[PDB]
Structures are given as C-alpha cells and as structure tokens.
Design a protein around this ligand. Structure first.
Ligand code: Z0M
Ligand code: Z0M
Lengths: 585, 585
C-alpha cells in the first residue's frame, strides 16, 4: 500500500518517499503545448485506454500531471519536482516525481520525456501510483534489434508491433537487414516495388512515433564490383538505394560484409569511406554509418593476440566515425568477457558495436530460444556503445529475451539475468506467467553440437536434482523422497504445457505448439523412466519392461520430431535412465 | 638384422649385444634336472611345438640352452652369463643372455626362471633369436585379474585359457569372485557340488603350473549374522568353505564386503581378524588375507580429506597383515592420481591393493572395452603392492586390456598406453591386427551417461579431424581435401569390420559381431553425412534430402541397437552433421 510494480528497464535511481495515492477519474494536464509531441501522444493513448479523462479547465482536487523538457518554460514543473531534475543527465535521461496529487515528468530531451511516460505507464496499476522520486538514463547510447536472420522475415504487422514494444521498453534502435529480403542482399541493386515502399513508410513513421532509430541495412557483398566503371555503376546503386529511403525519412544506414567469400578488406573499407563522405556528411543530418567486417568474431579476426590480415587492413582503412559490429569471441558464443571487448576495441581504436546472436535460431530452427541475456560482461559499456540482438523469425516469443536485453543495455551494472528473466515473463504473460515460466525454463540453452552455443543452461535446478538421483542410486542410498519429488516436477511440466495449450493467445501459440507437445512427451517419458527405476528397486520385471517400452517410445517420438527442447535435462534423463543398470543382482 | 620381436611385458633392462643367430634343429639342454619344474615344462612344450629337438648326448655344433636359479650350482650358467646375474634382484626377477649359439636363463627364484622361459618364448621367431642381455623383475609384486563382475561367469574352458595367458604375460594373481556364482555370494554358506569341485581342482592345478596365485573369494555380507550363536555358526561356515578349498591346494583367500546395505565396520573387521588368526596364521603357508570394505572408493571413504565413520572404524580395527582393496577416486573412474593412493594408503597406513573396474562392462553391457590401462599414475607402486583388473564377461576380448595390464604392473615406469595397446593387438591378432586396430580404436571409452566413466577416448585422431572439418565449414573455408580424407577413413572403417567378420576366429567373433555391424552402420551414416554436406555446399537440394534420410536412418538404427560403439565420434558425427544447417542462403 502502495507497492512499485515490475519495471522494465530498471530505472537508475528510484526512491519510495511516500505511501502512494489514487489517480482521479479525470485529471489536469499541464505542459502539453511545449512538451515532446510523441511523449504527449503516448500519454493521451494510455489515458484513453485506462478511462482517464482530461480536464478542460483546472479543478483543485483532481490529480495533476505535468510534462515537459528542461529547456521549456513550465514553472509548475520546477515546482512539482521539488529538488530533483533532469538537467544533470545524459541524452534520453528524465526525472519523474510522484507526490500527493502531482506527477511530474521532465526529460533532458524529447526522448527523455517519452521514456518518462513509459515508466509512468508501468507505475500506474488500478489508477494507483506509488510515491516515488526517479532519475533515469541509459548505460548504452544505442539499444535494440537487428532483424538480421535467415528464414522467413517478420511480417509487416509483426514489425509494427515490435517497434511499439521497443518504445515501451526504451529500445531506440531497429536495424532492417533480413538476409532473405531479396532487395536487401540477393538483388541489392534493385529498387523496392511501389507497394513495399509504402509499407516501409509506415515502419519509419512508427519508428519516429516511438523514438526508435530505423536503420536501413544493405548487403552488397556477394557480387558488388569494386574497380572501374562497374565499380562506379555499383557504388551508384548503393547511393540510389539509400536516397530512396532517406527521402522517406530514414536517417540511419548500414552496409554489411558478413557471410561472403570475397575478403577484399581495403575495398570494403573504401566503399564505406566513400559512402561516409558522399552520403553521410553530404546530407549533414544522418547518423554514423554502421557496418560489420567479413571477419566479425574474435576467432576470425585475431590469431595469436594479433589481428589477421583482413581485420588489420580493415581496421586501418575504415574511417573513425563508422560504427563496427562484432559478435564476440565467436559467432554464437557463451560469453563476451571484458577482455574480449578490450581486445577488439583496441584493434579498432574505437568503442565497438555488438551484434548478439541470441535469441536467433536460424541455425537450429527446432528449438525456441526463450532465455535472458546471458554471458555478457557487466562492464561491457567501457568498450561498447551500441548493443543489438539478432532475434528469432518468431517475433512474439522473441520478446522474452528482447525484454531482458532492454534491461541489460539500459541498466547494465545492476542486471541480474535470473530476475530479468522472471520479470520479463511476468510482464509479458499475466495470469499465464507461472506456467510459461515452467515451459520457457526448459528452452533457454542453444547448442547445434558444433560451432554454435549460447544461453543459460536449460532447467538447472531440475538438472541438479537428476544428478543427485543418480548419485544416490549408484551409492545405493535410499532415494524415495527424491523420486517422489521428481514425479512432482514431471507432473508440473505436463500441467503447465497443457494449460498453455488451452490458454495461450493464438499469437504466441502458433509459434510454440510443437515445442509444447515435445515437452509433454519428454515429461511423460521422464515419469515412465521413474516408474522403470522404481520397478528395478522393487525387483518387478513385468513393471520394468512395461515402463521401459513407454520411456523408449517417448524418447523415440521426441528424437524423430522436428521440435527440440530440454536436450540436456528432460531428454537426457530418459537416456540416462535407460543406460543405468539396476538389474545388477 | 633380427630384430627383437614384440615383448610383453617390457623387460626392465634389455640390450642388443650383437647381430643375432639361428637356433639349430636340435639343441643341448643343460640344467633340466636342477631348475624349476614348471619353467622346464613350459620350455619343453615350446620346443615340442616349434619342432626343436633335444640332444640326449652333447654336440658342439648344436645351440646350447642353459637353465636354473642363482642358488643352483651350475658352472655353464655362470660362464654363459659372463658378468650378468639375477643374484641381487627381487623375487620373480631373472637374467637372460643370448649370445654366440648360447642362451642362458637364470632366475632369482623358481618364478623368475619360469618368466625367463616366457621371455625366451617371445624372443624366438622361426628359430631366429636376437643377441640380448636382459635383467628383469616386476614393479608390483601381485599382478592379475579379479573375476568379480555381475553377469554370466566365465566358462570352465574360459578360465583354463585365461590362466595359461596369465602365465605367458607374467601375471601372477587370479581372484575367483564372480558375483553371480550362487556359492560365492547368494548361497555363500552352501558347499560346492562335487562336479564343480572337480572343475575347481583343475583351476588350482593349472594356476600352480603357471606361477599364478589362485585366490578363493567369498562374499557373505548380504546376510551373514554376527552376534550370539547365530554369528558363531556363520563364522564356522566361512571356515568350512575355506578349508574345503585349502584341502585342494588353495593358499590365498579373500573375504569381500562390497555392494551390501549393512555398514557394520567393527563387525566386518572382527570377522576378518578372527579368520586371519584361526585360519591364515594357524596354517602358516597361507598368503596374506584379502578384503574390500563396504566403503571401497574414495568418494565413499573420505569426506574433506578425512575418513568417513565406516572407513575410520574399519581402518582402526583391521589387522595390519590384511590386503585392503580399493577402486580409486570412484567405482568406475577416469584416473588414479598419485594423491589418491597416498590419501587412502595413509588412512589404512599400509600399501593398498587395487581393484580396477576396466575392462569390466557389466554396468553397460552393450559396449566392449578394448582399450589399454589408462589413467593410472606411473608412480602408483609407492603406495600400492597389489594390482588387479575386473574384466568383461567376454573372456577373449578382455585379453587386449589385460595384456596392457601385464605391462603396466610389471614395468610401470616405462608404460606407454598407446604403445602397449598397439603391441597387444599385434601380439594377439597376428595377420588381422591392422583391421582389429581400426575397429577396437572405436571401442575404448566406457561411459554410462551418469556415474560410470573410464578409459582412453574413442578414435582420437578421427575426432580431431571431424572437429577441424566443422571449424573450416563454419568459417566458410575450402574443406575439400579434408572431406576426401574423411571419405577414406569411413570406407576404411567399413572395410576393416567386413574383413573381421569374414576372418576373425569364432571365439573372438562370437563376442563382437553385433558391435562390428554397428560400426559398419555408423560408417555408412558417416559417409552419408559427408554426402549431405557436399550437397548443401553445391545447392543440390534433392541429393541433400536423399543423403539426409540415409544419414538419419543409419543413426536411428545404431541408437536402437543393443550394441554401442564410438558414441562421441562415429555416432556423434552424424548428429553433428544433421544439426549443421548449410541450407541458409
Ligand atoms: O552473424 C552475422 C553477422 C555478425 S556482425 N551474420 C549471420 C551469421 N553468420 C553466421 C556464421 C557463418 C555461417 C552462415 C550461414 C551458414 C553457416 C555458417 C551465423 N550467423 C547468424 C546466425 O545463424 C545469422 O543469423 C546472421 O545473419
Ligand atoms: O566394484 C566392486 C568392489 C570394488 S573393491 N564391486 C562391484 C561394483 N559395485 C558397483 C557400484 C554399486 C552398484 C552395483 C550395481 C548397480 C548399481 C550400483 C560397481 N561395481 C562393479 C562395476 O559394475 C562390479 O563389477 C563389481 O562387482
């Protein structure tokens, strides 16, 4: 009475200074005319949605809401704040104060005020708001998503929903770069058909409405020509393509050189340099150029602590103001330790950009990647200024992990993966969060068994209970309490998935139904594996064989089926149980 | 210009002193009346079998062979030896010199002469013998096999052949202790039927002829009673059972306490101490008593560098004379480092006996264990004086592993596991050795997925090549030459197994035919995996789908089979290749 709701991202400084209060049926609004337009529209939108009416003329005992920027002439704003302010904060910073009848939102800039509104929306539950002092700002200057995967691109409606979602969670960057949009890569020289041009316009419009930088990516590297008139003809295709998007309102651009056979470092860098001179600077209001080199992970860039030839030449040729992305120690890796960022930053003598390949699943499509940002150093901001994730072709389920990315990039120093994971599912799933937690917990780790691995381990608590079972059984100690307990877990998995099948909204259900079925199967095979152990302990041959065929048939279903989940946990347990000989005397 | 053939075990000191010579069709035998009877019978058997006649009257043109102990009075021996003796060597040591038509075998004791004859037998190839100076003796004084596994016990013929094989490889210990002989454990109180006693007499006799200590094990722990009249009766049952075996010539005995629920250390030890006194000492010619405690691996014996309650009590109570067995840091474990032996040896303050659970496969019967002794500290002899291995229910194929155990325990310091394994297969398989190497190289590592793991990794060099293929393909580099090399390895795996199916003697083929077909299946799936990769590289979609279906069926077949082989190499490669998504374009 009254408690601070789940917030995402976690604000830098939040203090509870009171007991909280109810916001009236209709309110007074001060500052609308000079405040940021986007911020105001997000406020209006929320206020309409929560049945809250705006007064035509001040009343004295309605709740008052004041909104604006530090540069603005609003005396009531300086008053309602009472001490704390956004003057001392970096771009996108804001102060928010809630004190008996008065909510004050002040941004350092228009972005700031918009962000303050988002926090305000998350603060209000039931018309009740807690009494708080807040100053808030991002750790990392550029935070967001690169739609950069292989497979079916996000639908136009998907992206519009993603862009809204980025705004709500203070993500400011969306990179358009679908490997399978023909006009982005395969037919990069060719202009967009009129109908896609108009859909693009809506995206840029929606991006501006949400303080998101729409970055238009192009990948010419498969066949771009570099020398002579063909080099001239090709460079002019790049400029043409860029201009047609610039004319629609695009102010951020990327040229990418990943996943190509050509390794002409000097020529790649020189294309970038010419585009930087003839397009970026010449336009004057365009953000820094973004790129990634053909060598983009530490394994590929560095040999024996020294940069390899391509990287060396690229690093020394590419202009200082161009943003360079890299993926970490590997393309899909467990971790980015600080020493890796330090290494790559020093090779490039600039703050680096990260293209994090998680939750992307294009390389192992059967598994859903449903875990938090995991493995990333909490001091990465020392060498990184731009942090993006590559998501799954499954736009709705990608939100869980994107939600944690939003918390990690905004408030890096206090990021707790486990807490951000739980908060993400809570905020996204409502009355279904506990069940969605059970399911998603078994689907966080990605491993193609060769070059690609990343994510928190699947269901670690349950894994540790399984190990303890084998430990007890092999030590020939009583294990019946732990066995009773594992029945509980396997029955819980199955119930959770069934409830999820019955109650998930279609938008989520269409992306995960097969994996839900997989987990039910594995749970059933897990339970039967228990029956099988109990039978051996009881020396009941009949009951053993009968549980064994069930367990083996469940395992066979799970292995033959497209969906993949819980490989090292629920699936491995069946394998472990079938390989454990308790028939020894 | 000989050369020295393969020898097992590796002699302590061997030196080539010349070019070698051919032994004549007929020879002069000196010392046959005075030297060890068992050594002479072994010698006569070898001569008979290699068409070498013995002169009844001396002939200066014939090769001269001289045999005896240091304690024997023989002038020719001393003369033929010329500087080298067994005088200052330990028990079981011998000297051997072959030089200028002379071969001199001198043992330190009768056991060493026998082993001298054994080295002679390995030295002669087609009447040719290298000219050598040898002094030789074991690192460890008790070396052998404990038949102590669960499963079908070895047949009577099995055991007779093993005992001969132990003789030839200088193994001096055989512990009879099969878990599923009802009279060993299940009905340990009940006497052996007379026909089984006759079978025992032949075992005892064969052991004596081969300098092997036949050790009679009994395991009363499931239900022995300790207190009052009940315990007295059960103690006399142990005496009776041992007496009946002593009466046939058994002079070593073991009483085991493993794999039972009753953890009464003081009682177990009291039983042992009583048996040590009223039986072993009462008899004067019985070797030290052998046991294992209910806590017999370091995880079960120790907590924070200190003994657990059972172990502490057992160690304080059990007589210093008694040999105590332990299995290392776990029951089935990768290694015994020196620090483990030192720890256990300190607790019991005595040199320890080792029960090594490799090549035993009772806990994972589908896999054959065909690797060398691996993981055992080369300095173990400082705290261990007794080394035995627990073999597979498969007697014949156990020989590969046992062969390397003979070399490790006899010549510990110079033991090379790769060399010994290679030598074992060369010596045992003859013309089939190169093919058997290909197959057995895939079947060395034991792993039940949970508590039990031990042995050399399966096909290491092939594993590293597969690793390098994935490292090239995921870096989009040219991998043609390496692909080609892999096609060759896989074809070779198939060729070897097919040649083994057609030409292996039945006694070995009976034990591995399922594992032969399984490796052929995986080899074919491996090939198909390569096909699938090359199709993906060439964008040939239909050849890919065709290869995919084959790779997948071959894996499914192997996974379904009782037979297990090459989990982490040949089998894993298919899973790796199916998960490697190269259709992303
Ligand atoms: O990671 C990058 C650029 C990093 S700044 N590019 C893409 C990329 N390249 C790789 C490794 C090389 C490879 C590509 C396709 C098939 C096999 C290996 C992985 N990935 C990502 C995950 O599959 C894929 O989504 C990306 O589009
Ligand atoms: O190891 C010993 C005494 C070592 S001085 N005893 C035997 C033994 N006990 C265990 C662990 C307890 C266990 C037994 C059956 C099923 C599951 C666990 C393993 N093993 C060996 C490997 O299977 C088995 O061959 C042995 O007969």
């Amino acid at each position: 009475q009254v408690l601070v709701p789940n917030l995402n991202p976690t604000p830098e400084n939040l203090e509870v200074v009171g007991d909280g209060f109810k916001i009236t049926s209709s309110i007074n609004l001060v500052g609308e005319e000079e405040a940021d337009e986007n911020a105001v529209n997000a406020l209006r939108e929320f206020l309409t949605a929560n049945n809250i009416e705006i007064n035509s003329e001040n009343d004295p005992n309605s709740t008052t809401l004041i909104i604006g920027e530090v540069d603005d002439d609003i005396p009531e704003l300086d008053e309602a704040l009472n001490g704390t302010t956004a003057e001392n904060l970096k771009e996108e910073g804001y102060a928010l104060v809630s004190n008996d009848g008065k909510i004050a939102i002040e941004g350092k800039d228009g972005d700031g005020t918009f962000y303050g509104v988002q926090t305000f929306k998350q603060l209000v539950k039931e018309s009740n708001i807690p009494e708080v002092n807040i100053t808030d700002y991002p750790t990392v200057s550029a935070r967001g998503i690169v739609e950069g995967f292989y497979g079916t691109p996000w639908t136009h409606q998907d992206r519009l929903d993603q862009i809204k979602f980025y705004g709500e969670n203070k993500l400011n960057t969306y990179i358009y770069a679908p490997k399978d949009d023909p006009y982005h890569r395969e037919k990069w020289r060719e202009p967009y058909p009129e109908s896609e041009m108009q859909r693009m316009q809506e995206l840029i419009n929606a991006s501006a409405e949400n303080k998101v930088d729409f970055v238009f990516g192009i990948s010419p590297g498969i066949d771009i020509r570099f020398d002579g008139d063909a080099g001239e003809e090709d460079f002019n295709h790049l400029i043409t393509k860029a201009e047609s998007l610039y004319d629609m309102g695009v102010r951020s651009f990327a040229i990418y050189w990943d996943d190509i056979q050509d390794k002409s470092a000097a020529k790649h860098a020189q294309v970038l340099n010419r585009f930087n001179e003839e397009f970026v600077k010449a336009k004057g209001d365009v953000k820094p150029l973004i790129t990634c080199p053909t060598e983009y992970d530490t394994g590929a860039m560095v040999s024996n602590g020294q940069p390899r030839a391509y990287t060396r030449i690229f690093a020394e040729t590419v202009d200082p103001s161009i943003e360079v992305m890299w993926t970490g120690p590997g393309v899909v890796t467990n971790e980015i330790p600080l020493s890796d960022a330090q290494l790559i930053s020093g090779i490039y003598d600039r703050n680096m950009a990260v293209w994090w390949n998680y939750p992307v699943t294009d390389y192992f499509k059967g598994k859903l990647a449903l875990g938090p940002m995991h493995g990333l150093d909490k001091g990465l901001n020392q060498y990184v200024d731009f942090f993006t994730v590559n998501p799954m072709e499954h736009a709705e389920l990608s939100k869980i992990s994107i939600h944690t990315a939003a918390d990690y990039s905004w408030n890096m120093d206090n990021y707790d993966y486990d807490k951000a994971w739980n908060r993400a599912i809570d905020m996204l799933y409502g009355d279904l969060a506990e069940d969605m937690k059970v399911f998603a917990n078994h689907s966080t780790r990605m491993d193609n068994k060769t070059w690609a691995k990343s994510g928190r381990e699947d269901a670690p608590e349950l894994r540790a209970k399984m190990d303890e079972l084998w430990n007890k059984l092999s030590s020939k100690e009583d294990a019946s309490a732990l066995i009773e307990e594992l029945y509980g877990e396997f029955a819980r998995m199955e119930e959770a998935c069934n409830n999820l099948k019955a109650n998930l909204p279609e938008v989520a259900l269409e992306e995960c139904s097969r994996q839900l079925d997989e987990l039910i199967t594995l749970a059933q095979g897990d339970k039967a594996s228990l029956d099988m152990i109990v039978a051996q302990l009881n020396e009941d041959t009949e009951a053993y064989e009968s549980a064994k065929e069930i367990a083996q048939n469940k395992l066979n279903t799970a292995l033959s089926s497209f969906a993949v989940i819980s490989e090292k946990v629920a699936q491995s347990f069946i394998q472990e149980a079938l390989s454990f000989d308790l028939t020894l005397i």
